[PDB]
From Swiss-Prot:
The chain holds residues 381 to 430 of 502 of the full protein. Changing Y31A: Strongly reduced interaction with ubiquitinated proteins. Component of the ESCRT-I complex, a regulator of vesicular trafficking process. Binds to ubiquitinated cargo proteins and is required for the sorting of endocytic ubiquitinated cargos into multivesicular bodies (MVBs). Plays a role in the proteasomal degradation of ubiquitinated cell-surface proteins, such as EGFR and BST2. The lineage of its organism: Eukaryota, Metazoa, Chordata, Craniata, Vertebrata. This is Ubiquitin-associated protein 1. It is linked to Spastic paraplegia 80, autosomal dominant: A form of spastic paraplegia, a neurodegenerative disorder characterized by a slow, gradual, progressive weakness and spasticity of the lower limbs. Rate of progression and the severity of symptoms are quite variable. Initial symptoms may include difficulty with balance, weakness and stiffness in the legs, muscle spasms, and dragging the toes when walking. In some forms of the disorder, bladder symptoms (such as incontinence) may appear, or the weakness and stiffness may spread to other parts of the body. Component of an ESCRT-I complex (endosomal sorting complex required for transport I) which consists of TSG101, VPS28, VPS37A and UBAP1 in a 1:1:1:1 stoichiometry. Interacts with PTPN23. Interacts (via UBA domains) with ubiquitinated proteins. It is found in: Cytoplasm, Cytosol; Endosome.
Length: 63
């Protein structure tokens, strides 16, 4: 799912099924979209990772 050269941020608008779930997932866990988004593009594809990175920014609150 890619071809159009021009249009990067466009993805955000219509992310993929793997990215959407990633975001949504965490977003559901009780996180932000922007952060998660970045984290996702930072850590890539790996909730755990995104979580590890997220926590960093996020505050320590288990439960």
């Amino acid at each position: 799912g890619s071809s159009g050269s021009s249009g990067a941020y466009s993805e955000l608008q219509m992310l993929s099924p793997s990215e959407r779930q990633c975001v949504e997932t965490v977003v559901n866990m009780g996180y932000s979209y922007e952060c998660v988004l970045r984290a996702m593009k930072k850590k890539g594809e790996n909730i755990e990772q995104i979580l590890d990175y997220l926590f960093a920014h996020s505050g320590p609150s288990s439960g």
